[PDB]
Design an enzyme around this catalytic site. Structure first.
Site, PDB file in Angstrom:
ATOM      1  CD  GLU A 177      -3.092  -1.126   2.069  1.00  0.00           C
ATOM      2  OE1 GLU A 177      -3.198  -0.137   2.812  1.00  0.00           O
ATOM      3  OE2 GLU A 177      -3.957  -2.031   1.993  1.00  0.00           O
ATOM      4  CD  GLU A 198      -3.701  -5.901   3.633  1.00  0.00           C
ATOM      5  OE1 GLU A 198      -4.601  -5.097   3.953  1.00  0.00           O
ATOM      6  OE2 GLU A 198      -2.480  -5.652   3.858  1.00  0.00           O
TER       7      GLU A 198
END
Ligand SMILES: Fc1ccc2[nH]ccc2c1
Ligand SMILES: Fc1ccc2[nH]ccc2c1
Ligand SMILES: [Cl-]
Ligand SMILES: [Cl-]
Ligand SMILES: [Cl-]
Ligand SMILES: [Cl-]
Ligand SMILES: [Cl-]
Ligand SMILES: [Cl-]
EC number: 3.2.1.23
Lengths: 485, 485
Positions: A206, A383
């Site tokens: 991220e 995720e």
């Protein structure tokens, strides 16, 4: 029944800072993140919760118990990271023939002698311990994705309190090309040390959150919390070239696949008149970054040292974002997606999590097929999960999102596994321990792990490689009438 | 971990009227209950839901699938009933040397010739089908409790619409000693036909509900819905002696244990000044009935034909009742127990079910130990469960109540099994299909069964004979903040 390819793997993702500490001798006091969450002013401001990561779930000491439970649950893949700070707790010598004023970092030379010199400064106790953890993982038959970076930096590269205060004379994290240079060398070094245990690599987790929350979304409590559009852009520019230099670094010592893991949302139109707003949001949040590290396109020029630096894409997906067209461009709307009330319903009547995130599994199909059609690089869902201590919504959240991956595969997208966030509860950054994403519930006093019913559901999925007939009813929205709203 | 004796059995209870119908050829149109729930005036009044039992879960045809799932779940005991109406769909000859005006029925003679004559009037197709169901049950290693009566009567013994209208010249159910006489003969006949498959017997299920809801709690939609204190007492007097005459009847053909199954509440004091109100409520709701069929005590006299007619007690427990002392005596309080709002919280802050019933597992310990200390007869928990289609609360409800049985055993009470209500969703009387008590969710269009996560939890309990360490956290109250309130 919804069956998956024989090679598809179900598993989990986990982060070092969030899960490692909690057992005797496990504390890592040497990151920007550790300083940030202990800082008295940040606590007084409520930027951080006051919970402290050293009271966490204890994976550093108790990893065999984590892995035992994952094996019993039928899981076959894990994505974990090594914490840079644990490997290099003290500073490295500043690079000699390196010009900190040069905006562009187009090469970071790696060679055997450089790696042997780096080895002199590495914490061998941490290296050996990680080898033991990863060997135990591999001995359960788990496929291993090793991620190099999941937000905390060594304090010797980033003092976030100094930057928060507007002092840029010290180690300034992703605002400095020193960090770009050292990240490339760190990634090469880890691959050199662990390639025998690793199946695939990710450079980072991220990166868009690092730049976006650190320098714009400053109420989030993400370090260094210095509000600046200009510096957000500078941080993202450096993190892009750091990805490329780490890709090349790993490839200098390994033949294995190297990808990246990204924070994704599914952008949805408020009305049928808002499809161009969706495209703009996808450009501004997703395509600008991946066009840079796949096509070399950056602000327009093409950099040949950025082009082609990606083998696979890790999709991190939790909920949607609803957008509408404005005169100036587009805006996101509160009351949907990640901007809802906690334990309530969205403006669309969909239930929200303990974090205020809307239930929207179709978004995962949207993101997977959008990536596939643009780049045709294979993917992992790295995720997906929900803040839900009570486990009311997670059984539906799990089955419904897994079903959407099945749909994406049926449409042609090359998706090779699903990794839930997360196996066990952990330290959720500025929110502390109160947001519980585990299939397993953690008692933070005893460090014991408990199976939530969704973990029993996941075992059914993973051991059968399918959403079986008996649990297909969970491919549905959690009933809203019995929930808070 | 909370472990149970090696001989303790986990299983389920189920009723014929509620679960049998739904497959082709399964309809039983010949009960008071069938007439009652199809009656246009009852539907217009909202006394019944308008849902019809012939659209039910289809156990008559699909029993092998029910039993397959129970076996996979590790269950080792089942309690089922035969439907009287299926065995005798047409009337029997009125007994000759029997005086319908005599208040007391002290003996109902059973002999071989009487049984062979009864056999001439029995539906052999239904008898053979029940034998097939029960053989299949036994072939899975399930211990079998056969209950004779679970509320519906043959219409030739009870026309409930005629009684509702105030006409007592027709078949009047438990208001008539003809029903007492025929129930004793029915029970003897079934034991004579099925004793080779049965492990233990129950005469009836919740007789206190028959008298209490049929003749006082008339808004409940329980037939015949004729409001009369006097007739409620007459019905309960007859059902008591019917139990005794059925006990003797079964014992004339079988040596196996014969018990009864009762609707229980745990009576709790509003304040510490209300303990005498608790004792009074226990007298008025529980002890008067059991003192009659165990000690022969009835209104005081002792009837020697009632005394000692019980080998074991089936506890059906769902929630508590809160009482306070009044000038006249005691009263129950709304906002607790079974008088709460649906999908809300009680006045005590405890969550309530889809039916408005309060979460109160400690009540089950109270009831089991109260029975044990008074009578020292062994027990089964023959019903315990929750209306919860979404499955939000059932995992906690299941584990917490099982834990309270463990507590009761540790305190000395002889409790030999736990039977959940129920394996699958079913027709919940005047509420129709909307109240879902199953471990398994039923799709009433397809008759398919789906495993709710609580069914996976139950498999963990049953296959291990224990609340295992991994699920001990479910011995707790469902978190109330995320639920409707
Ligand atoms: F509380 C927080 C929030 C975001 C973060 N990123 C790296 C460390 C850290 C700590
Ligand atoms: F709707 C209902 C309610 C209670 C009952 N008892 C026997 C049949 C029956 C039907
Ligand atoms: Cl995105
Ligand atoms: Cl491309
Ligand atoms: Cl805790
Ligand atoms: Cl009671
Ligand atoms: Cl006694
Ligand atoms: Cl249905």
């Amino acid at each position: 029944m919804y069956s998956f390819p024989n090679s598809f793997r179900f598993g989990w993702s986990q982060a070092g800072f969030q899960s490692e500490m909690g057992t005797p001798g496990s504390e890592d006091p040497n990151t920007d993140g550790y300083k940030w969450v202990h800082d008295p002013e940040n606590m007084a401001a409520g930027l951080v919760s006051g919970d402290l990561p050293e009271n966490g779930p204890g994976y550093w000491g108790n990893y065999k118990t984590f892995h035992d439970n994952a094996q019993k649950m039928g899981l076959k893949i894990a994505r974990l990271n090594v914490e840079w700070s644990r490997i290099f707790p003290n500073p490295l010598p500043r690079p000699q023939n390196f010009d900190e004023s040069k905006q562009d970092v187009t090469e970071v030379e790696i060679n055997e002698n450089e790696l042997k010199r780096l080895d002199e400064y590495a914490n061998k106790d941490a290296l050996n311990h990680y080898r033991e953890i990863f060997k135990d993982l591999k001995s359960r038959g788990l496929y291993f994705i090793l991620n190099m970076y999941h937000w905390p930096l060594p304090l010797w590269l980033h003092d976030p309190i100094r930057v928060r205060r507007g002092d840029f004379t010290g180690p300034s994290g992703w605002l400095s090309t020193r960090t770009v240079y050292e990240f490339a060398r760190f990634s090469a070094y880890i691959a050199w040390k662990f390639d025998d245990l690793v199946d695939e690599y990710s450079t980072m987790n991220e990166p868009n959150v690092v730049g976006g929350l650190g320098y714009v979304g400053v109420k989030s409590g993400f370090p260094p919390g210095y509000l600046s559009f200009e510096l957000s852009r500078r941080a993202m520019y450096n993190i892009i070239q750091a990805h490329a230099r780490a890709y090349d670094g790993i490839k200098s010592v390994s033949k294995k696949p190297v990808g990246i893991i990204y924070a994704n949302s599914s952008f949805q139109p408020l009305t049928d008149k808002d499809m161009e707003a969706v495209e703009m949001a996808e450009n501004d949040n997703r395509w600008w970054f991946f066009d840079a590290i796949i096509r070399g396109e950056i602000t327009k020029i093409v950099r040949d040292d950025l082009k082609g630096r990606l083998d696979w894409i890790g999709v991190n997906y939790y909920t949607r974002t609803v957008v509408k067209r404005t005169e100036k461009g587009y805006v996101s709307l509160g009351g949907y997606g990640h901007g809802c009330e906690r334990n309530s319903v969205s403006l669309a009547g969909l239930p929200t999590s303990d974090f205020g995130w809307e239930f929207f599994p179709e978004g995962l199909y949207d993101v997977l097929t959008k990536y596939w059609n643009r780049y045709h690089l294979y993917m992992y869902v790295t995720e997906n999960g929900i803040a839900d201590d009570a486990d009311y919504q997670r059984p539906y959240y799990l089955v419904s999102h897994v079903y959407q991956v099945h749909r994406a595969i049926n449409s042609g997208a090359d998706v090779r596994g699903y990794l839930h966030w997360s196996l066990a509860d952990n330290y959720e950054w500025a929110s502390g321990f109160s947001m519980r994403f585990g299939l397993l519930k953690v008692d933070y006093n005893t460090k014991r792990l408990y199976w939530r019913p969704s973990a029993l559901v996941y075992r059914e999925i993973a051991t059968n490689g399918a959403i079986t007939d008996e649990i297909e009813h969970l491919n549905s929205v959690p009933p809203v009438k019995p929930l808070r709203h």
